[PDB]
Scaffold this active site. Structure first.
Site, PDB file in Angstrom:
ATOM      1  N   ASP A   1       0.843  -1.435  -0.122  1.00 14.36           N
ATOM      2  CA  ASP A   1      -0.016   0.155  -0.071  1.00 14.36           C
ATOM      3  C   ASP A   1       0.736   1.232   0.071  1.00 14.36           C
ATOM      4  O   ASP A   1       1.223   1.742   0.987  1.00 14.36           O
ATOM      5  CB  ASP A   1      -1.019   0.059   1.105  1.00 14.36           C
ATOM      6  CG  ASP A   1      -2.096   1.092   1.182  1.00 14.36           C
ATOM      7  OD1 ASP A   1      -2.093   1.901   0.352  1.00 14.36           O
ATOM      8  OD2 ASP A   1      -3.059   0.771   2.088  1.00 14.36           O
ATOM      9  N   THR A   2       0.792   2.103  -1.101  1.00 16.26           N
ATOM     10  CA  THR A   2       1.643   3.178  -1.283  1.00 16.26           C
ATOM     11  C   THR A   2       0.876   4.307  -0.636  1.00 16.26           C
ATOM     12  O   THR A   2       1.619   5.293  -0.359  1.00 16.26           O
ATOM     13  CB  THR A   2       1.761   3.422  -2.832  1.00 16.26           C
ATOM     14  OG1 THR A   2       0.597   4.006  -3.550  1.00 16.26           O
ATOM     15  CG2 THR A   2       2.493   2.555  -3.515  1.00 16.26           C
ATOM     16  N   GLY A   3      -0.480   4.185  -0.345  1.00 13.63           N
ATOM     17  CA  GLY A   3      -1.261   5.080   0.427  1.00 13.63           C
ATOM     18  C   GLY A   3      -1.095   5.258   1.858  1.00 13.63           C
ATOM     19  O   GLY A   3      -1.726   5.989   2.499  1.00 13.63           O
TER      20      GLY A   3
HETATM   21  C1  LIG Z   1      -0.097   5.972   9.729  1.00 15.64           C
HETATM   22  O1  LIG Z   1      -0.327   4.765   9.005  1.00 15.64           O
HETATM   23  C2  LIG Z   1      -1.623   4.705   8.286  1.00 15.64           C
HETATM   24  C3  LIG Z   1      -1.606   3.237   7.541  1.00 15.64           C
HETATM   25  C4  LIG Z   1      -2.807   3.086   6.841  1.00 15.64           C
HETATM   26  C5  LIG Z   1      -3.895   4.160   6.810  1.00 15.64           C
HETATM   27  S1  LIG Z   1      -5.149   3.540   5.740  1.00 15.64           S
HETATM   28  O2  LIG Z   1      -5.326   2.269   5.707  1.00 15.64           O
HETATM   29  O3  LIG Z   1      -6.602   4.318   6.169  1.00 15.64           O
HETATM   30  N1  LIG Z   1      -4.786   4.117   4.233  1.00 15.64           N
HETATM   31  C6  LIG Z   1      -4.477   5.657   3.904  1.00 15.64           C
HETATM   32  C7  LIG Z   1      -5.503   6.348   2.888  1.00 15.64           C
HETATM   33  C8  LIG Z   1      -6.901   6.067   3.682  1.00 15.64           C
HETATM   34  C9  LIG Z   1      -5.204   8.007   2.871  1.00 15.64           C
HETATM   35  C10 LIG Z   1      -4.454   3.211   3.313  1.00 15.64           C
HETATM   36  C11 LIG Z   1      -5.344   3.122   2.132  1.00 15.64           C
HETATM   37  O4  LIG Z   1      -4.837   2.538   0.979  1.00 15.64           O
HETATM   38  C12 LIG Z   1      -6.767   2.074   2.555  1.00 15.64           C
HETATM   39  C13 LIG Z   1      -5.947   0.716   2.970  1.00 15.64           C
HETATM   40  C14 LIG Z   1      -7.101  -0.259   3.504  1.00 15.64           C
HETATM   41  C15 LIG Z   1      -7.794  -0.027   4.311  1.00 15.64           C
HETATM   42  C16 LIG Z   1      -8.952  -0.912   4.676  1.00 15.64           C
HETATM   43  C17 LIG Z   1      -9.328  -1.980   3.859  1.00 15.64           C
HETATM   44  C18 LIG Z   1      -8.597  -2.217   2.562  1.00 15.64           C
HETATM   45  C19 LIG Z   1      -7.566  -1.113   2.252  1.00 15.64           C
HETATM   46  N2  LIG Z   1      -7.392   2.111   1.464  1.00 15.64           N
HETATM   47  C20 LIG Z   1      -8.959   2.531   1.393  1.00 15.64           C
HETATM   48  O5  LIG Z   1      -9.188   2.844   2.434  1.00 15.64           O
HETATM   49  O6  LIG Z   1      -9.465   2.226   0.557  1.00 15.64           O
HETATM   50  C21 LIG Z   1     -10.686   2.817  -0.049  1.00 15.64           C
HETATM   51  C22 LIG Z   1     -11.036   3.124  -1.250  1.00 15.64           C
HETATM   52  O7  LIG Z   1     -11.029   2.152  -2.270  1.00 15.64           O
HETATM   53  C23 LIG Z   1     -11.572   0.954  -1.568  1.00 15.64           C
HETATM   54  O8  LIG Z   1     -10.718  -0.015  -1.398  1.00 15.64           O
HETATM   55  C24 LIG Z   1     -11.027  -0.811  -0.340  1.00 15.64           C
HETATM   56  C25 LIG Z   1     -10.927   0.267   0.674  1.00 15.64           C
HETATM   57  C26 LIG Z   1     -11.395   1.346   0.049  1.00 15.64           C
HETATM   58  C27 LIG Z   1      -3.584   5.189   7.479  1.00 15.64           C
HETATM   59  C28 LIG Z   1      -2.477   5.343   8.109  1.00 15.64           C
END
Ligand SMILES: COc1ccc(S(=O)(=O)N(CC(C)C)C[C@@H](O)[C@H](Cc2ccccc2)NC(=O)O[C@H]2CO[C@H]3OCC[C@H]32)cc1
Lengths: 99, 99
Positions: free
Chosen positions: A25-27
């Site tokens: 996850d690059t995000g």
């Molecule tokens: C401080 O360290 C951190 C690590 C991770 C995060 S985070 O997970 O909210 N985030 C960041 C994003 C929401 C900006 C990563 C996103 O890529 C996050 C990772 C994830 C979380 C739960 C389930 C599947 C995937 N992806 C995400 O929210 O994707 C949304 C939008 O598209 C859909 O794909 C499945 C979930 C949905 C936050 C903080």
């Protein structure tokens, strides 16, 4: 090698003697894994994303095997719906975004 | 081009004739943007993030430029901590993960 994005970029990591499926996850700033036991001291932390915040335990200097590499990094353990490999670890294995 | 991950992969996108900053997110299936106005009708969609689920507005076949590359696809609008470019659009611009 090259990893296409048609499907979720999932990989199998080795951590604390356990095998887990995780998302490249690059995000994600940090790596976040579902509840598990890890050695050493930890600090409580709150991380936010879509849906709000979740409380996690922060463990530093954790050895993790991923994509053939042996990396060291911070791991956040908590009630995350999916195991996520954040940038703090992705950089260590030399992973980059290309287009 | 190549984008390393030491810092957040924030890029400039263009949608509705305006420039915005968005995060290249390989961990996101879909593209979710902060509150904004988009043309046409929208459909309801439930997406689950790290902190739970949220309701978003789904707009289809929306023109959106990412890193200068033109794409036309689905854009979800809702309560997200930051604009995120998911795999649905990352694939349209030929983005991949490499190591
Ligand atoms: C401080 O360290 C951190 C690590 C991770 C995060 S985070 O997970 O909210 N985030 C960041 C994003 C929401 C900006 C990563 C996103 O890529 C996050 C990772 C994830 C979380 C739960 C389930 C599947 C995937 N992806 C995400 O929210 O994707 C949304 C939008 O598209 C859909 O794909 C499945 C979930 C949905 C936050 C903080």
């Amino acid at each position: 090698p090259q990893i296409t994005l048609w499907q979720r970029p999932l990989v199998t990591i080795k951590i604390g003697g356990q095998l887990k499926e995780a998302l490249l996850d690059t995000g994600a700033d940090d790596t976040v894994l579902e509840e598990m036991s890890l050695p050493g001291r930890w600090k409580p932390k709150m991380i936010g994303g879509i849906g709000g915040f979740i409380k996690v335990r922060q463990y530093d200097q954790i050895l993790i095997e991923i994509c053939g590499h042996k990396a060291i990094g911070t791991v956040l353990v908590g009630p995350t719906p999916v195991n996520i490999i954040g940038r703090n670890l992705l950089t260590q294995i030399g992973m980059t975004l290309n287009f």
